[PDB]
């Protein structure tokens, strides 16, 4: 790698970032606008995504 | 020395909660 | 080759000052530049490495800024220790040219 | 740590040779290239020369070219800058310093030279 | 404008013998490099064009490597009708520059 080496050349910096969508408990979540449970009405209700 | 297995083997096959329902 | 000077003359600034130098290139050098800090009788300190990052060790209060041609050096704060002399490299290019410098002063 | 040390400089006759020998220890001497620099009283730094990791390759500065020599020994740890034709505005106080312009970049602390 | 100097100023050997005939260029010049044998009291031959290709009707015991700035020219065994002065030109800009000169 060098500064001369074109664009094509040039070093990149790679992440990947790998998901597994499962019904397991899924800690890692990115909360936000979290609410109260409510109970014994029909309602929209999101539940670890 | 070798033993049958008998019905021994059998982990389960997912997260997934079921009951009452016979899955393949 | 790539000729380094710095534009601003010798600033002497008091303790816990906001000091900015400007180092230029003469042609673009991209992202290629690292800002050292030497004390007198002392080896130079590599203050940040190419620009935005900050080497390690070295106080959170410089800064590296500056793309292409123009590359910028700011300390947020003055400190006895800071006050030095400083100089930019051009990286790019295989020879490499050093900053003419700028004195810190009490 | 990582900690560079430089000795061979002393004052020396105009068109003497002088060579100046560059410590490493603390880290893996053969795997970093090394540079070499030189700061001039009451002046900006000049870089001297480089050499490669390996050695096999090297490059010189347009005013030190044809009379400065650099060399280095894997097993030593020591990269030598041989000066040849010196002359009083070669006199600098030369730098020996490891990767440099990059987050790997260390300073040694110098030895005087005089001419 | 690109500055081009073969770092072999005059090396010359013995026949049969593996030669080295580096060239480099100021500023990167991609691939664009092309390099003549000039024997004395004739017509520049071009030995390599475009830097890794042989030129047509030359012996293929001349050898060019390298990209960018750094470039190297390899003669796997030397013969009499080898000597003669080696010359590297960049062809990447518009103004050309031929290398110093490199006697064999």
């Known amino acids: 790698f060098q500064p001369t080496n074109g664009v094509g050349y040039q070093p990149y910096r790679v992440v990947v970032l790998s998901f597994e969508l499962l019904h397991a408990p899924a800690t890692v979540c990115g909360p936000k606008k979290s609410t109260n449970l409510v109970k014994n009405k029909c309602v929209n209700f999101n539940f670890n995504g | 020395a070798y033993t049958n297995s008998f019905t021994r083997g059998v982990y389960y096959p997912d997260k997934v909660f079921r009951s009452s329902v016979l899955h393949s | 080759d790539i000729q380094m000077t710095q534009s601003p003359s010798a600033l002497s600034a008091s303790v816990g000052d906001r000091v900015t130098i400007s180092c230029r290139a003469s042609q673009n050098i991209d992202g290629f530049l690292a800002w050292y800090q030497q004390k007198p009788g002392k080896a130079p300190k590599l203050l940040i490495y190419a620009a935005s990052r900050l080497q390690s060790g070295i106080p959170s209060r410089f800064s590296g800024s500056g793309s292409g041609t123009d590359f910028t050096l700011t300390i947020s704060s003055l400190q006895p220790e800071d006050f030095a002399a400083y100089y930019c490299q051009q990286v790019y290019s295989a020879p490499l040219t050093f900053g003419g410098g700028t004195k810190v002063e009490f | 740590e990582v900690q560079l040390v430089e000795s061979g400089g002393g004052l020396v006759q105009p068109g003497g040779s002088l060579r100046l020998s560059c410590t490493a220890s603390g880290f893996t001497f053969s795997n970093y290239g090394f540079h070499w620099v030189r700061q001039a009283p009451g002046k900006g730094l000049e870089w001297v020369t480089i050499i490669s990791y390996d050695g096999i390759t090297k490059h010189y500065a347009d005013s030190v070219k044809d009379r400065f020599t650099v060399s280095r020994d894997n097993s030593k740890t020591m990269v030598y800058l041989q000066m040849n034709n010196l002359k009083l505005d070669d006199t600098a106080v030369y730098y020996c310093?490891?990767?440099?312009?990059?987050?790997?970049?260390?300073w040694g602390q110098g030895v005087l030279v005089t001419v | 404008d690109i500055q081009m100097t073969q770092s072999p100023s005059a090396l010359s050997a013995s026949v049969g013998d593996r030669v080295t005939i580096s060239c480099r260029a100021s500023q990167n010049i991609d691939g664009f490099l092309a390099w003549y044998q000039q024997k004395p009291g004739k017509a520049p031959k071009l030995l390599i064009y475009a830097a890794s290709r042989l030129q047509s009707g030359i012996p293929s015991r001349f050898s060019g490597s390298g990209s960018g700035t750094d470039f190297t020219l390899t003669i796997s065994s030397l013969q009499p009708e080898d000597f003669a002065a080696y010359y590297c030109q960049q062809v990447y800009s518009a103004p050309l520059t031929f290398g110093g000169g490199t006697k064999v």
């Open positions: 310093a490891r990767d440099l312009g990059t987050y790997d970049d260390s």
